[PDB]
């Protein structure tokens, strides 16, 4: 079941879905979510609202919801592709192979282009994507490239996956989400500086991007850059309140700067204490 923001200021806002799209485009995720939720309220059965909601939620570094809203959308509109994709990435992040692969399998299923065309179930779906990919000789399919890079990640081949993502990115040089999947995949592939450039790109596109601030932080840790890791964690929470996992990371980086007063503030999740810090924000 989905937890809705109670007393939604925008519940009666007429253009709610459309408006949420505007806000989203302008990089405010929290308000975007408010408008999406309001949308769903005005029209419970409206699936696009659920799609964008789930996705946005994922970009909000709240995955738990992203999944519920996504499975909601697919419950209503089982053929929704953006949702199958997103939900696959999310099932990935939370380490469920059966389910990620399920949604990929079905993604292909509902995909008009691809209609025609320990663990070898995963392997089967991977081959499955690879073939159709090959069937597109010249022009590539960023969404297909996506699910494929995912399958590679999930399978463990990081270079392949990265290729898939630069591939997609070639078609959509501006997809902030994809720049994130890249950074995420490099960092996850223990190539951290690379990952950082990717994240920086994403955030240069959608500066409201929670998941990229987070991922970025993780990378900075991996680099031993701490003051910066923290800065990103804070900036994140500041934007998110406008997830505990972010808290967790922060607590860690902090522990590495060995800054005890601050670390205590963090252990308590006392946020404004941390704005400064040193004249931060």
């Amino acid at each position: 079941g989905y937890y809705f923001h109670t007393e939604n200021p925008f519940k009666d806002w007429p253009g709610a879905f459309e408006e949420g799209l505007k806000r989203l485009k302008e990089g405010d995720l929290p308000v975007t979510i408010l408008f999406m939720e309001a949308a769903i309220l005005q029209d419970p059965g409206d699936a696009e609202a659920w799609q964008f909601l789930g996705i946005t939620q994922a970009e909000n570094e709240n995955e738990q919801a992203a999944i519920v809203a996504l499975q909601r959308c697919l419950e209503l509109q089982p053929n929704n592709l953006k949702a199958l994709m997103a939900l696959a990435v999310s099932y990935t992040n939370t380490s469920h192979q059966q389910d990620a692969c399920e949604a990929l399998k079905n993604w292909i299923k509902q995909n008009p282009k691809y209609k025609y065309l320990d663990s070898s179930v995963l392997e089967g779906v991977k081959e499955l994507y690879l073939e159709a990919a090959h069937q597109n000789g010249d022009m590539i399919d960023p969404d297909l490239q996506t699910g494929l890079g995912v399958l590679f990640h999930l399978s463990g081949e990081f270079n392949r996956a990265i290729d898939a993502f630069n591939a997609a990115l070639t078609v959509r040089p501006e997809d902030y989400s994809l720049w994130n999947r890249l950074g995420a995949t490099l960092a996850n592939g223990d190539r951290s500086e690379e990952a950082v450039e990717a994240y920086t790109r994403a955030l240069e596109i959608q500066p409201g991007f929670i998941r990229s601030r987070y991922n970025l932080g993780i990378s900075c840790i991996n680099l031993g850059a701490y003051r910066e890791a923290v800065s990103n964690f804070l900036t994140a929470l500041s934007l998110q309140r406008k997830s505990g996992n972010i808290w967790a990371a922060l607590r860690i980086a902090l522990s590495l700067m060995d800054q005890p007063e601050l670390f205590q503030a963090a252990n308590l999740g006392d946020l404004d204490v941390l704005l400064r810090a040193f004249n931060l924000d």
Partner: peptide
């Protein structure tokens, strides 16, 4: 020791 989100 950590994991990045896609």
């Amino acid at each position: 020791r950590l994991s990045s989100n896609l």
